[PDB]
Design goal:
Chain B: It is found in: Secreted. Chain B: This is Transmembrane protease serine 2 catalytic chain. This is part of a larger assembly, with 2 copies of chain A and 1 copy of chain B (236 residues). Helices cover 9% and strands 27% of the residues of chain A. Chain A has 5 helices and 18 strands. Chain A has a 4-stranded antiparallel beta sheet, with no helix packed on it. Chain A has a two-stranded antiparallel sheet with strand order 2-16. In chain A, strands 5-14 form a two-stranded antiparallel ribbon. Chain A is elongated and about 110 Å long. With 236 residues, chain B is mainly beta. Chain B is built from 2 helices and 14 strands. The chains are: A mainly beta (292), B mainly beta (236). Chains in contact: A-B, A-C. At the A-B interface, loops of A face loops of B. The structure holds a molecule of 2 linked components (NAG-NAG) and 2-acetamido-2-deoxy-beta-D-glucopyranose. The site of a molecule of 2 linked components (NAG-NAG) has 2 residues of chain C, from loops.
């Protein structure tokens, strides 16, 4: 660990539920390393315990076990960020790459979880009989649940149709009437997916000949921010242990280094588990094999 | 009224029941023993007649409703600026022959003075004989509940009441639903607690559904018409 | 055990572990694939297990030692299931003495 902190420029290093001094001279059976970039605006949200966006939608650090945190830096001259959305249902209906800018990281602001029956599509026959505020309708693949839209009678209007998830899933008036529900990620998994605006998904007057594709503006709940500071990028890493004083993986710092030999001087040697005393003299040999 | 608790006797001593054809059809509110406030759309033709009506006061239950009630029903007064296709100025005044004697559980509500600085999200009470099912069947006891006043600029959103709210119209209830009025609550008194004094600021006009989401209540703004009410005081 | 080239009907499956358990010694060694024989020496002493191996007809060389603290009792050779070892197509035989 000393060589790791020396070679890689370490800005901060702490450990929760464990002592840093106890790491020197111990053996851990396994170590899990979770690393990701640090946003400049929301860096303070990386504290141990906070109701921030990073801990509630991107990655949460469990405090019920002994772990360690390391904030380090890296020269921003050769830093590239590969963005991806770990959402299945969002990518299924036509999600693509962000392609915003370089040296920028995207953090999710809201997380929504759905079951295996949701579809950002309304019923064509139901949406056709809506002369006022007709929602867009299209066809869904085999097996889903279309948008719940009902036509309610008014004083003079008889074609006023309402739907669910209005106006937006972030500020929905009735969350219980919408299919997608806001969920909080725990420890181990990723974000379920971004928000989906049903008003911007699909086309108008579709005779079951087009899938449910949402525009790029229909996805909400994320923000991009730069990560350049003093021509460098800050990266956070979390080391999770799996056992104390048990495991083949130990610390090499608490061992005996490989010193330099000395000729024509009486020296005490500890060569290959065999101890003794004597003088060393350099000579040319050819009878030494690989294992000998 | 859906999702409301039973009203104990001597709690809302201003519930006046208007019964036509020997059955209660609409409610009302009493401010003075000579005038009763009710809905104007329910008093239209051919029901716009001085006779064929009955006023009941102090009836804590529908079981006691039988032969024998208050004074005779006089002529009805409607706002000339009211319309049928467009809901506007839905206020009606009913006159009685004999004055309403103030009994033990009888207390008229006070008219709202022009200028009160009402809270935007203020808790108010709605009491009457409503329903708790699909359009209901009848109502045998008083049902009362509490609601909130939705903002005018928020209730007329493009998804609920786009261009369907007049300056003399307010919304009471919950946006999520499950608490609202239903069919049969014509003239439901909308009273609020301000400085330990109850004020009547709303009047049931119409609605969509019963205790449903995205469909708040609809009430009339009496404060605009209060002066017109005083006009009736200048008439009789 | 199955063969990589000219695979059999079934698949190689001798252990079921979702994750890698705690191992004590892991290395990789090389040998000449053109040889015709291979020699192995396995034994244990004072709870320490030694290994030796050789390619040609020569005395074996050191491979490794392992400390276990327990006396092992059984060894086994997994049969090879392949579509080429059969004498119908290649006339080859497996030998492990
Ligand atoms: C010893 O060599 C074998 C064969 O090259 C290695 O097994 C491969 O390991 C890689 C990485 O885990 C896998 O992607 C391959 O599928 C494995 N191939 C086979 C045939 O198993 C093994 O990892 C090497 N051992 C060490 C310690 O390096
Ligand atoms: C003895 O001394 C000489 C001269 O100082 C030196 O070169 C030599 O290495 C020494 N030998 C030992 C065994 O110390």
């Amino acid at each position: 660990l000393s060589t790791l902190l020396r070679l890689v420029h370490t800005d901060s290093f702490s450990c929760n539920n464990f002592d840093e001094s106890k790491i020197y001279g111990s053996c851990f059976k396994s170590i899990v390393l979770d690393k990701f970039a640090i946003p400049n605006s929301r860096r303070s949200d990386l504290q141990l315990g906070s109701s921030g966006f990073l801990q509630s939608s991107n990655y949460k650090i469990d405090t019920t076990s002994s772990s360690c945190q390391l904030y380090y830096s890296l020269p921003a001259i050769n830093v590239t960020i590969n963005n991806y959305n770990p959402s299945s249902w969002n990518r299924r209906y036509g999600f693509n790459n962000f392609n915003l800018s370089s040296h920028s990281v995207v953090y999710s602001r809201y997380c929504f979880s759905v079951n295996n029956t949701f579809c950002p599509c309304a019923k064509p026959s139901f949406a056709s009989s809506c002369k006022s505020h007709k929602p867009p309708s299209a066809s869904c693949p085999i097996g889903t649940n279309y948008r719940s839209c009902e036509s309610t009678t008014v004083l003079d209007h008889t074609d006023w149709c309402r739907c669910s998830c209005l106006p937006d899933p972030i500020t929905a008036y009735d969350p219980r009437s919408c299919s997608q529900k806001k969920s909080l990620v725990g420890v181990g998994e990723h974000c379920a997916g971004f928000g989906v605006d049903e008003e911007k998904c699909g086309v108008l007057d579709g005779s079951y000949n087009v899938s449910c594709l949402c525009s790029t503006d229909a996805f909400l709940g994320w923000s991009y921010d730069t990560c350049v500071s003093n021509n460098r990028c800050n990266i956070f890493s979390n080391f999770i242990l799996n056992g104390i004083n048990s495991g083949t993986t130990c610390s090499n710092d608490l061992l005996q280094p490989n010193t330099e030999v000395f000729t024509d001087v009486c020296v005490d040697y500890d060569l290959y588990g065999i101890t003794g005393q004597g003088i060393f003299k350099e000579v040319s040999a050819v009878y030494y094999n690989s294992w000998q | 009224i859906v999702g409301g608790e039973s009203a104990l006797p001597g709690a809302w001593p201003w519930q006046v029941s208007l019964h036509v054809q020997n059955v209660h059809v609409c409610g009302g509110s009493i401010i003075t023993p000579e005038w009763i406030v009710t809905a104007a759309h329910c008093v239209e033709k051919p029901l716009n007649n001085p006779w064929h009506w009955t006023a009941f006061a102090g009836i804590l239950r529908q079981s006691f409703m039988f032969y024998g009630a208050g004074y005779q029903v006089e002529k009805v007064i409607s706002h000339p600026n009211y319309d049928s296709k467009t809901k506007n100025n839905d206020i009606a005044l009913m006159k009685l022959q004999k004055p309403l004697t103030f009994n033990d559980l009888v207390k008229p509500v006070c008219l709202p003075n022009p200028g009160m600085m009402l809270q935007p999200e203020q808790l108010c009470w709605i009491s009457g004989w409503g329903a708790t099912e699909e359009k209901g069947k009848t109502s045998e006891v008083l049902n009362a509940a509490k609601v909130l006043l939705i903002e005018t600029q928020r209730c007329n959103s493009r998804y609920v009441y786009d261009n369907l709210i007049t300056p003399a119209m307010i919304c009471a209830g919950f946006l999520q639903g499950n608490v609202d009025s239903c069919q049969g609550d014509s003239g439901g008194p909308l009273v609020t607690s301000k400085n330990n004094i109850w004020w009547l600021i709303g009047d049931t006009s119409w609605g969509s559904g019963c205790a449903k989401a995205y469909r708040p209540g609809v009430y009339g703004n009496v404060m605009v018409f209060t002066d017109w009410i005083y006009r009736q005081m200048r008439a009789d | 055990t199955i063969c990589k080239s000219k695979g059999s009907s079934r698949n190689e499956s001798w252990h079921f572990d979702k994750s890698e358990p705690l191992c004590l010694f892991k290395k990789n060694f090389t040998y000449n694939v053109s040889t015709d024989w291979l020699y192995f020496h396995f034994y244990q002493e004072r709870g320490t297990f030694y290994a030796y191996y050789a390619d040609s007809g020569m005395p074996t060389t050191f491979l490794f030692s392992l400390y276990l603290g327990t006396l092992l009792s059984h060894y086994y050779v997994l049969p090879l299931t392949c579509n080429a070892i059969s004498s119908n197509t290649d006339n080859e035989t497996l030998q492990y003495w």
